[PDB]
Design a protein around this ligand. Sequence first.
Ligand SMILES: CC[C@H](CC[C@@H](C)[C@H]1CC[C@H]2[C@@H]3CC=C4C[C@@H](O)CC[C@]4(C)[C@H]3CC[C@]12C)C(C)C
Lengths: 346, 50, 33, 59, 180, 35, 117, 188
Amino acid sequence: AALAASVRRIAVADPEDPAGRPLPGGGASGLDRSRGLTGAAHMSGQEAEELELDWGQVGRGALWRRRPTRWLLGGLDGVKDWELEAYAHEPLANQLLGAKYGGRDPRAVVADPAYAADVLRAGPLLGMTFVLRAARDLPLQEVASSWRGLLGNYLQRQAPLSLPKAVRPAHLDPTDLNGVAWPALLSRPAAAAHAAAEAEAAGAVPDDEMGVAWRVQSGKEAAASVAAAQQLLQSLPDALCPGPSPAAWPLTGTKLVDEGGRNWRRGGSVWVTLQPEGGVLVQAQTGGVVGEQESYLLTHVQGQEALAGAVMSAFMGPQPLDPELAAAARSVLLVPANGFTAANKE
Amino acid sequence: LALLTWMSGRLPTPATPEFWMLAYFGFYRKVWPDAAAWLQGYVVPLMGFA
Amino acid sequence: ELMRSAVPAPGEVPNRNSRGQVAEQVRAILDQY
Amino acid sequence: NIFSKKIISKVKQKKQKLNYMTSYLNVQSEHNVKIFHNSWWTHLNIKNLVNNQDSEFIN
Amino acid sequence: TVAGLLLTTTIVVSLYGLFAAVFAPAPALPVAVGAWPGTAAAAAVMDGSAAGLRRLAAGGLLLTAAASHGLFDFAGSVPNPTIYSLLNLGFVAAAVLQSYFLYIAPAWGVNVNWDTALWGPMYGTAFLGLVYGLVALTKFDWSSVVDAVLRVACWFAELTMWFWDTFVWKFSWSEKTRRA
Amino acid sequence: FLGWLLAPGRLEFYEKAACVAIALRVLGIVIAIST
Amino acid sequence: PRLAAVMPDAVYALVQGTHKLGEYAHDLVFPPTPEDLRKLEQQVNATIPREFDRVRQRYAEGKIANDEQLSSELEDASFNWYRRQLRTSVVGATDEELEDVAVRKLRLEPPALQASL
Amino acid sequence: AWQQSFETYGGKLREVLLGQQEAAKNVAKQLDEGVTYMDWTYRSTGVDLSAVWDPELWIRFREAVAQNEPAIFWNKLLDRVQYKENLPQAGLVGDMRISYAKFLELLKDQRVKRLVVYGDMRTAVVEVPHPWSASVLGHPATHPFYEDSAHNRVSMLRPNPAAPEDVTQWFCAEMPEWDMEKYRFYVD
Ligand SMILES: CC[C@H](CC[C@@H](C)[C@H]1CC[C@H]2[C@@H]3CC=C4C[C@@H](O)CC[C@]4(C)[C@H]3CC[C@]12C)C(C)C
């Protein structure tokens, strides 16, 4: 661990016995060349591709306490709450949406609302990520009440969810605890189309071109899940602010918030991801010197389809927090469906 | 201005050539090509035309 | 002994005195009393 | 708090003497102004001896 | 005085707002490509419910323009020097109230930065009305701001004289002495 | 500049001048209170 | 008189006075701790050598001095600590022979890294 | 009266500072970094003060006011004013020049302990240990710094299993620099 914490790279003697001359291995390792930096890690392209960072940036937007005015002096009136970015899985974005809406006029594909409901309901399937960072000083009570009022209306005004059908069980193989079957799933007989078809014969036949058999849940399971979601949000002033003592608050004792226990630091980042089956992943990261950045995993709830739908149709829904990033992200989710990738790593 | 009044023994007013030489050279060719951008980016938005 | 610095410390350098300084020392101790 | 001040002043002067005396291990001395035959070599104009007597590419 | 400059600048700005508002049919709102291709009024045209709104704004701007021209060329002697004290109310208070509306405009979330011929003269004439409230509030003599100029010039002169005599060359050295 | 300004010879001159200065100041005030 | 002696005293007085004024600036804005003064009490106590603890107990039980007998008591404590440190320099410490002195002043051994963690 | 103002403003300033405590410790770093390297003065005033300003003296003054040891300051400042006294006078005796080829040769074969390149970068003082004070051989010409219990100086030879029979190709540790006797040669 002490070796790993420092940087010292040590050449390796050749297993060839004659002289033990160190080999030209060396290595620049653009992930190593990037410490000491502040914002991100320049990566020289292909290196990030071989690292499986399969979430290309899709849209940048800003949550403003008050958007800036051109007319008053210099736009100093502009006060921004957060600076948010979004990302989405590009291989899968090519796989599902590229087989149905690909091959047409891009304008014609985005122009009809079928594609809109597509990008709305198939969002959580892609494992879409939202990375929003702190742009100023933030007390937790303030932004917490803000978030409650923000996700209340999206909790109230939404219909039953539209979910696919689980074709394969995907049991785990405990004795093999790092093996995943999707290579076998695509290369079972080298003709996996027919076996996959006779496999979905049991569950259901897809409703459209890409291969999803939609099932919008009926009357019930549409309020019980929403009631459980409202409950999970009801735990925000309690989980964020348990009791009157910050000494026992979960935020104190680490650099994501100040040592005073009541302000959140600028450069703090929140990552949100949405699994297919209503699962939520949420992480945090205090920014700054890349050499000492601290990542944090907050919680992993499952089954909460209501909050997943709320997040996706709040960021990208009919009435999003800022329609500009919604439009930009939908168009830039169209652009890789032709095959390519934004931030062109080929 | 301070040094000119101390040396010549009188303040340069718009009635004198010293004031106009100072104005033109100093002001117009040293501070104006930048204070112009400052006012074009800070005070003109307040009024009607952007 | 692999992760030692080879740059000793600002501290573990003991003093070494020039000729003028040994003369200063010899005077200040011969007439200490 | 006087006793600590006195005993620590004693060991401070003692450590100073340890440093100025022999191989002590962590202490920083203080230097003095030198008022004597200071540098002894600016007292001299020796250019005529060294250049063996006994600026045109510029302009 | 700055009263004349105030009112004549409100004249120019309001008449230019009119000349740019009554001569063009309408601007166009950005389409924001890919913004909810169904509902939410995106990727549409501006409505016949706002052109008349723009013309009404322009007509009010013209009426207050002619009002400012009247007050300016009337009180240029600053016949009635004191009657306008009534319309003084009307000329200023509402103006400030105007700004209040626009000061709550970012709160309502209405966008004023994208379009040119609507909120530009809005904020301009509103702030200019508050500034006329200032011109009547502190009564700039047109020679008092010049006095502030002279005050800061005298202060900086006393700073540079000290800087010279302390760090550049002593005033006792530079100046000639007499009697011998 | 300072190494030339605070040379030992200039130091001794400064010291002697200041000594005579303080001497004459206190002697003048002695003869002035003696009036 | 003797500027060569005045200048070092001048700079010493300057920096020490600045340190005092900074201490005052820190004790009024941030008032002093009520009980961690005992933390610093004991942690400046712990580094007092053993040869002084003999008067520390003599400082507790009444018979310290009038004011002068201690100021000639702790003198010989200072001096025996002085000669003890001299012997530790030359002939080494109590549990250390000449081979270990040559080891220590040749800087032959590294600081124990396995025992560190 | 000044103490009356201190006791009055102290309680007010303490609470105001403890209020934020987040910018009041980054305003500290900005102010200290700006006062250390006076690199803000050109666009602020027009006088580029960074060319006559000395960061190391300021950092030493800060440390000597924070740890109350004036030597850390004085000891530095004194060698600025008295720089002509610190030219080497010990290992240089007469016409102690070497030639550029002799210096290059000594450099290539690792006999130079310390190279001191001067201000103009066109003059150097080579430092070369006495041959017996270079390694830790127990030669009876080095002062007995390191000795055994039985008072025999220590030596650190290793017989070079690849090239034996020639003592000059053996391996041995080097001696601490503060224990070498050194010639200080001059070179243009
Ligand atoms: C409109 C909000 C928007 C971003 C989305 C965030 C605030 C939402 C997405 C997932 C949610 C959590 C899911 C499970 C947990 C754990 C539970 O203990 C209490 C409720 C809580 C925090 C949930 C509530 C907060 C979370 C993070 C912002 C950008 C406006």
